[PDB]
Structures are given as structure tokens and as C-alpha cells.
Design a protein around this nucleic acid. Sequence first.
RNA 1: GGAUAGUGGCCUACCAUGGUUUCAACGGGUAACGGGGAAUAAGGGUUCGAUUCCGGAGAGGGAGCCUGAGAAACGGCUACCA
RNA 2: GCGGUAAUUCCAGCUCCAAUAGCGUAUAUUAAAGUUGUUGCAGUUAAAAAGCUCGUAGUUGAACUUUGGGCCCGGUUGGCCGGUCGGAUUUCCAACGGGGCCUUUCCUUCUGGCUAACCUUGAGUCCUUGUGGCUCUUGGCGAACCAGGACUUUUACUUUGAAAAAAUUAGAGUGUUCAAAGCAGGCGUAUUGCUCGAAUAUAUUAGCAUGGAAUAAUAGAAUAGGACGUUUGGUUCUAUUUUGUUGGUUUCUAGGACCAUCGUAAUGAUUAAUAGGGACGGUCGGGGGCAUCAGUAUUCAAUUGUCAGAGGUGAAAUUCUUGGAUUUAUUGAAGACUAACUACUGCGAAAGCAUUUGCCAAGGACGUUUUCAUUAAUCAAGAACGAAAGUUAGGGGAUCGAAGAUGAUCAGAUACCGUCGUAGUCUUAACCAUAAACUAUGCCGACUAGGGAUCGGGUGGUGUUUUUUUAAUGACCCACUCGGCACCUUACGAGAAAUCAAAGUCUUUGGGUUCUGGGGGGAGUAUGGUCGCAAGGCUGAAACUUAAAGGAAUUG
Lengths: 146, 144, 129, 81, 150
Amino acid sequence: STELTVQSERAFQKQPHIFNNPKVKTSKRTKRWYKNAGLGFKTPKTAIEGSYIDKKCPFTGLVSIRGKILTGTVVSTKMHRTIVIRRAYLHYIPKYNRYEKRHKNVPVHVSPAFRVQVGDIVTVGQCRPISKTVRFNVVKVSAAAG
Amino acid sequence: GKGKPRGLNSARKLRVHRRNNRWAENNYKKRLLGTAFKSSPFGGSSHAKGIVLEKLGIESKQPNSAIRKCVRVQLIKNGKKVTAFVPNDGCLNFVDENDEVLLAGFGRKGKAKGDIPGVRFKVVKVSGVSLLALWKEKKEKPRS
Amino acid sequence: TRSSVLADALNAINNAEKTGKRQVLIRPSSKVIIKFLQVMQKHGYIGEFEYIDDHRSGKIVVQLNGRLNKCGVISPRFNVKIGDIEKWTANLLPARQFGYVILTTSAGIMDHEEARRKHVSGKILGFVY
Amino acid sequence: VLVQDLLHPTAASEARKHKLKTLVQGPRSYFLDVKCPGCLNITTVFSHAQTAVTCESCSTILCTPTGGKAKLSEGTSFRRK
Amino acid sequence: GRMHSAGKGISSSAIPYSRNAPAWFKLSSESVIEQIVKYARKGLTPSQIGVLLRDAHGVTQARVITGNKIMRILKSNGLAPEIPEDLYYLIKKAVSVRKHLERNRKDKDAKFRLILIESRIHRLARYYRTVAVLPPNWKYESATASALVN
RNA sequence: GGAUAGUGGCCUACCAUGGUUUCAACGGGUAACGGGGAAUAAGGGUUCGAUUCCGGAGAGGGAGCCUGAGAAACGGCUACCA
RNA sequence: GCGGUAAUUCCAGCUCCAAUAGCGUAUAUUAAAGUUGUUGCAGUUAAAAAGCUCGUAGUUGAACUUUGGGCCCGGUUGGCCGGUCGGAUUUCCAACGGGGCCUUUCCUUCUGGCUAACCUUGAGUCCUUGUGGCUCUUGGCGAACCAGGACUUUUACUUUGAAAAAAUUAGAGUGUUCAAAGCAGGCGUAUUGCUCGAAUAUAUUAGCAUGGAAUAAUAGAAUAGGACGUUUGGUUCUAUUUUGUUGGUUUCUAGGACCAUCGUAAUGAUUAAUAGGGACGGUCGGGGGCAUCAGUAUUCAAUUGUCAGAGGUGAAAUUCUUGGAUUUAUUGAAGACUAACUACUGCGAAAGCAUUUGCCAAGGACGUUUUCAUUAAUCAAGAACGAAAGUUAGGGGAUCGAAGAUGAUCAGAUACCGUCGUAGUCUUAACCAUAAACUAUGCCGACUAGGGAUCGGGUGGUGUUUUUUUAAUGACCCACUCGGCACCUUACGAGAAAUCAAAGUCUUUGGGUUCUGGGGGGAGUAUGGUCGCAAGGCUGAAACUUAAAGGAAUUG
């Protein structure tokens, strides 16, 4: 569950059209923009005080949350900024009248204002597809048993 | 008891077990490998036009004795040589060599009838008429 | 081992009433069993009965009276959409003027006539006639 | 039989049954109160005792553990409680 | 009946109909707690503590006389055993049978009983890692089997 | 960053080894276009659906592109192959 | 199945039967088919319980945590009701929960927006004497509805609603002349027109709003990093509104969060499953392994003693014999074996294991006012063991002994019978992985009927005996109990039946679950795969063929 420095790659990670004016004495140490996610969900305090960028985040970021809202547990965490959900559910069969246990996987974009690991029932909404698998951004988290 | 898993979630176990016990039904595997369109002499057809090669004396089974006056034909579409029965009385003499007859199944899906051994088929027409009409003298055959 | 104590208790009921005894003992219990037996009692298939709070399970001794043809469970506690309750009671009861299949409605354990009264349904537990 | 007070059975029928099939399941093991002839202290001794029972005074054995009920050593005074 | 046999026996122990007070007892609660802790610090296991308190002291059981059970009060007072004791006794039996195998190879029925004992250890230890008295991995291993018993 | 109508490994540089799977992945068959439905029907079902409608896909095989709001159009062009 | 000389089946005629402007045929899917089975099969013997356990997935899993309306009703305790020689009741009657009826029916709460209607009075006017009656609020009443919050364990389940294109389908209206159909049409005042219509149902999982909180899982608070809070500090941000306004700094309060103090508290751990795992006890058994020990027998050898046969067989012959064969005796060696005890007994997962003694570790059951507290049940892939025959090299190798030799018996005998004889038998190290591994009966569970013996453990007995004297047992007897291999009778039951205490508790059909069979051959063959030194194992069809293959039982 690792993090990084301020700037790492060959660009300078900032947000678009946010201009920390060097001439005026910035009493505050940044101009950190964010938004409210809606659907009753709360921006974490870590997001506002934080120092990541992640343009794909619903918080301090440029994508938006709409479409389906879902939950699920976390089975993989070994990517960079993405986890892998397992929406466990039951499938009916008409003929046998009996359920059958089934699952999918739906990898979502873990933002670095959210500390997740294996366990961690999360809640996560749809956010204008990010890469080939990931269409979902995590918005709320919770632990597993303790 | 009873064997089967009666569980309210056991349906994939139930359905796999059914799917794999279906093949012992003679007809589920017979369609689903594709065995009519593979190695039955016809390709799912009911009749096939054929060419007469030979006239065969197939002698009947045990509680009978008779020589059955069958014919040995070759398919057009596929090249198979196959026995065929020439039905009712005197209609062997209505067929000569290479008479492009029409073959049907025989009444039991593709097994024999009664006391011809091994034959599957029959002729219904010769070169474009019939055999009922020829046998009851109500049609005369064109000459090629 | 000990899968469904409803089929265990009804197993004893049916066996004793098959063989003509007049009462029965049942070792485990459950509040599912108590609500099964209150329904059988107030429809009138069972006389008195008595919880014995042996500290472990609570045995139950049932003063049967005859007048009972069969009890049973339906072992997956199947869901029942409220149209399919008649498909059930057709499938597994002997007529259309007696016999009670027993649901598990969210309004409680009831039988199918009370299910159509209170206009609610859910699983199925078993049946009695 | 067909009918019997399964709720209230006779004490003969009750005494002739196992520890568990009795209607309330309960023990048969009973504590004893033993004084040795040597000392005068009372010791509370399990009937089916599993250790070599001694007294805190005078270090003598009281009960040898065996198959079922514990075999007391010699004549020592015991009251069944 | 059993986990690993053809045996269907039922010898057991029936706690009497009493939540409390075989009233003729009349010793104490805290002093018999200190009795438990003294025998425990003498190097006794919870089961052996219980049977000695039964036999030589007439104690019914500690859950009755003092409210709560024995390994619980050990785990309170800080004399807690590290691995649970029934898992400990299973591992002890496993090293015994393993010693006997490495000194007597051709004893294959004893290798089968070894299979059953390693089975019990995996099942019970699986349970203890689920309810988190172990670390969640704990890595029970055949070569370090001597390390927990010696 | 380019490309695009626009998101997007769609592509490129760089940087991590990830992602899927005995709850059946990947690979094979098919006489596989799918769905609306059809047949047979006690109930539970089983087989079929090229076909009068919706959605798809193709204009001999395969790619490319002008025109145009819209086509990888073929009752358009160009290339090859048959 | 007819047809082999008088064919109720062929070929004709006569007569009839059925479907009828249609009838037959071929082939394929559907019903028949409870012959694919979830409802709903079957496995002792008909096809079919894996050799046996272990075990991951899957599937399943003991018990336990309280309920706002009333009208009618019945059921139990009960009191003023006791009449009857301690019972004998009615009902003016509370509630104890229980069955219908309309609804209490609600979302738990702040932040105030805003109050419908006021506790009224702000005084008397219109009008019947006036709390009749409004125009009105200054002291009250928010939920009749709004949005910034916090209620927040998530579901699986079920009720209701919106979607569930058109045709189709079910069906409502309608005389298309009936109708298959269509969406029409119908009435006048027919001369200057009126009008109904073209419904409804259904659709599913998946969603999406909504009520229900039983069932079924899931979270808490134990090594208190807990909630309460009016508390007491201290930290950090926080950043509105007033400072004319902007931007910066600081007083402030607000709002988080965190950390210690005292306070608040019944402070907090559900049973202990005739579930299971452990601990301890005295036992028990032909459980395994390694030693070690013994027995008689067979064969061989030496030493004798004696005289013509000795084997061997259905009767014989092969062979051995005056160089003493068989027997006798003495002694020794060699190997396997473990009889008499030997059973309707034990033990082990099974194959299997019977000499003593010792060690090595195990193990079932019993006893348990001990322990932990669901730690389980069943098992695809997977692994262990796995009789005997095999196979690879040893060391043994006596007896029996496939192949082989002969001698017999025979129409022939490369077969049974006789005499030998290698591999084997035995074992160490290594493969193999099969059997009628058969109780041809999966496994765990609960219930259903009489009995007497049995093994192991326990308990009781004014029981017996041993003797030295009662005591200590130990054995025996009586009665019970758990476990165990079986048994004997009946059928309530099951079955096609022989038969069965499980093969019962099944059409009146469902306790958890694993495999297996779907007519007979083909065929455990083909080929692909894996394992094996090899013999062969596990996986495993098709072509085509045939109306049977069969299963208990009756009579011959």
C-alpha cells in the first residue's frame, strides 16, 4: 500500500487552469481545488489537505461520478492506482428453481485519498471509462470484519 | 438422501451433472457431435438421388427364407455405395443399370426392416416417376 | 449431522403418528419449531405440548391426538413468489379445502390462507394436513 | 404402550437409565466428605476422581483412581455429600 | 461419529441443572481464583487445573463458582498459553509419531495415523487462524514441529 | 504527447508486472447471425427460430479512399487475388 | 409375424373400415418418456456404491437475543358471585395471550423555514336570552411539507409501482353472410348527420423507487486503543459574518479530528449440542513396526538296526531298491509355517493381522460437576495404504509348485490322475495399483418392534467363591447402561420378488452430500493423453449391427 513523492514523472503534475500566482504572497501553501461527489457521498479530509494530483480522481480531479453505483470487496491490490473488485452475487436458474453462486471482477481506480487493502468493502460509481477495464472510481470505503 | 444435492445453491452442480448425463441418451449426443452431418450416408436429407450399380440377392433372416431382390446404388452427392430395397412385387424388372433412382429411409430411423439384413434404404422412383404408378400400371416410363 | 431440526422434529411426529402412538418426544427445538407447532395446534392437529427446558436444546413433548395425516418439510426453504403459492399447494396438498403449507413470511410463519389474507409471502418451510 | 407420561416418568424407570437419556440430562457423580483416621480435616472428594487423592496434612493417600468410581484407600470416614 | 474413525461412541459429561451455587461448598471466589493461578504458575494446563480442582478440592467448575471459565481467567491474569493447548497436544502427538517414523520407516499404518494427525492439525489450526488467536498465517511446518514441543 | 468527433493503450516514449482462471479462463467445434417469437402444451420443460419486425453484418475474397451531415458506400472509384 | 398345398396378412375380385378434397410416405424435433428425473427415476441381485480412508474447491451446517389500535369471538387462571351434602355456575369484569375487521401505520433525530389549528383574548358588533357567528394575534401546537445534517451492518428473500416496442399469445366489443380473418362499425330524421369504439391481461432473471424484519448468513465490546459528556485541558486546522471593500496578519466564536484527567454505567465474554476436537483415568485387542524366543512337522545329511520290496492310484505304470530302498532309533542343519485354543469372538481405514517376551509409538470404546466453543458433514483436482500374481538386482532357498519333462487315462489329451522339476513361494531395497478388493448394500444424521445369548468399559447387590478368617481383590451370579460383531420371531412398513431393523420412515413424492447407470453387442476395442522397466493402469468414443440382454419366482 505504497505512496510516492510530490512530482515524479517527466511532467509537472498539477491540475488544469489552477494558477498558484507567484507574485501575490500565497499565505496558504496551495490553491487546491476540489468538488463534491454528490450521491450523498463525502470528500475525505485527506483529499483536501492532500498532495497527490491524479486527474482521474473524483476529488480534486477532472472526471465525474454518474451512472451505476455499486459495492463490492477487494481481491487484488497490486496495481498502481487500481484495485480489483469481486462483485459476488447469486444467479438464479428457472429450470432447477435454485440459485448458483457466481462472481465477476470490475477493477476500479483507487484514489490516493483512500487507503484500501484486501478486505475493505468499498462503494464505487461509474466515471467515463479510464482504461479498457476500469470504468469505476472508488468513493467510499469500509473494513472487512475488524 | 436420494443422491442429488438438494441445496438451494446447488444448481451448477445440478446442471453440470445433468448435461454430462445427457449423452447416454442416444439422441442428444447424436445431434450434438453432429453425427448426421458427419457420417450417416445422407447429410440430414430424407431422400437422395442415386445411380444403380448392381442387383443384389439379399437372403432373409432365420424364421423366413426368400431372396429379397434388393439393389446396390451409389449416391450422387457423396459417392457412397449402399444397398436399397426395391419394393413391391415385380418391380425389380422395372429397374436396369444406372437408372438414377430415388432413395428414402425405411421406417425405423436408419435400421433394417423385418428380414432384410443390414439394409437401410428403399427406392421410390426410377429416373423421375414412381414405383406405385408403375406397379399399378397407371404410368409408363420415359426412355432415355 | 444435524441439518434441519424442523425435519428432525416433524420426522418424529410423522413416525409416531404413523405407528399409532398418542404422544411424542423431540430432542432439539427452535423458535421455528415452536411457531410450527403453534400453527399446527391452532389449526387443530396437535393437542397440548410442553417445552422441557433441559438447558441444552429444550426437548418438546407433544400430546398428539390422532386427526393428523402428514407433516413434512420442503428442504431448501425455497422462495415463493405470491402467485406460485398456489402452484405449491396444488403440487403438494391433497385437495382444495384443507391442508396447510407453511410459509416463512416476513409477517411471520403462517399458512397459505393467512398468507393470502395478510397479502404477504416469502419462503416455504413445510406442510401439514 | 402408546401412551405414557413422558413428562413425568417413574423413578424406577428414571434410575435405570443413562446419564443423557434421562429427561433432564444430569450427572450421577457425587462428592464425598472424608476424614482420615490420622488427622481430623474434612476433604471433599469426587467419586470418579482421576488423581491420587491425598490430604494436605499427613501426606497419606485417600483414593486411588481406577476405571470408574475412585477406589478409596482404606477405612476412612466418608459422608455422601 | 468421530472425525477420523469408524467409531460411534457417546461417553461424555453432563453439567448439572445449576447455573450457580452447590451451596454446601462455602469457600470463596477470589481465593479459588488465586488457587487457579497458583496451580497454573506451577506449570499446569487449563484441563489439568480443572480436574485437580474437581478432585482434590470438590470444585464443580470455575464458570459456576467464579462466573467465568479457566483459560479465560488465565488469559486475563497474563499466564496465558501461547498456542492453544489442544493444538499443542496435537502437535506433540505429531512429533511422537514422526520420530517413530524416521526411526522405523516400514511402519506404514503408523504413517497413515500420521496422515490423520497432520489432518487434525491443519483443520484445528485453520480454525484458530480464523478466530485470530494465531497470526493469520502461522506456517505450521513438519521440520519445525520439534520446536513447539521441545 | 499524438491521433480522433470525443473518452480510451486507440498509438507512441517512459515507468511499474500486472490481468484472467476449477464459480471453467484460454483454446477448440457448430449443420451460430441474435432478439420479437414458433411448435408441442397438466404442471416443471424440451427442441427450433435463414425468413413478413427491431438490432446487426456483407456487397465475389481483402484492404484503402475521394465526395458528403452521414458510406471504409461497391446499382462509387483504386490496388491485388479468384 | 404370414407364405412350405385346402394363407382371416402375399397377388387379384367381392364386401367392408377410416380419413375425406384430401390420403399415404421418408426424415427430423415435440408429447407419449417418472426412458434424463429440480417437481421426478434408478444402483443387494435387472445396467449401475469408486478397494479404502485423508482432503482443497463446491454444496450444507445444533440451539439463543420482546409484542402499541380497537369491534366481535372462543380458550385459562380469578375474584362480589357457593346454590350442592371440598367440588356445582352464570355473568355487570379487568388482562393472559390467540383468530378475523377498519386502521394505530411512523422515518429515528436535529438546522429552522412555516406553523394547519391555537390555551386564547383584541374588544363587541350581525342575529333567537348567547361561548350561535367572522374581519382578526401580542403570551401556544410544527410534521400538513422542505433542505443543510447526523439515523446508518451489508445483503440474499418477498410485497407493491414505472419500464416491460408493434405484431404474436390469452381475451373484451363487432354478424367479415358463418368463419380463417380484419379493426371495424351501428343508428337515423337517409333531404345537406349523430355516435360509441379499436379495452385489459401477460413479460424474468437484470436493474430502478417502495413496505415487510420471520427465515439465511454477516459487525460489534476482552491484551477495552470502546459509547456516553453537562465535564477539565492542550494541540492543529478550520474561516463564515462585523470591521467602507480588497488581500495579509491577530482577538473571537463556530466546526472537525486527536491526545491525557474525573465523572456517567448492572460497564461489557449466550448455551455447553446423546455435535466435534483435544486432557486425565483403569482397562482392552490375533491393530502396525523392530528385536527376540519357542514348537512340532517336512526335506536333506551322518551314525546305526533288519530284510525284498517301497512308493503311488479308480485300478496301474514313471521312479527308488542285497552298493540295503520304506520304516526304526540317535543327533544336527536348513528354511517357511504359527495347527490342537478356533467361535455365527476380537482388532484394524481397508487389504489384512493369531507363538513367548521386550521396546517403540499409536488406537477405539467406557468414566469424567475437566477443557476449547462450532473448531463440523460430504468430497472434483489432488495424496497415503493397497491381497495375490507380476517385474528390476540381491540373500536365501526346505515344502508345495504355472512353464517343462515324462507315466497314465482316453477316438485324440501339449487336460484333470501319478513322479519329478525352473520362475515363484521367503525376505531386503524399488516399482506396480489391480480382485467376486463382495455385506455385490456410499457416507454423517433423527425416528419406527418383540427377545435372548455375546465382547469391552462402567454402576449397584443385607449376592457366591477362592483362603489364612472375615478383609484386598480376581473369577462367578442377578439387574441396568454405553459402545460392538452378529442373531431369533412378526410385519406397521419396503419390494418386481427372493427377501430386508434397513433395502422402513416414497405419488401422502424434498434431512446434508459424493460417485454411478440410461436396451443389448461393438467395447474397456479405437485414437489422443498420462503413468509403468515391462506386463499393463486411470481417462475413453464412433462406424455398423440386433429385438431383445436380462431379474426374482411357479409348474414341468
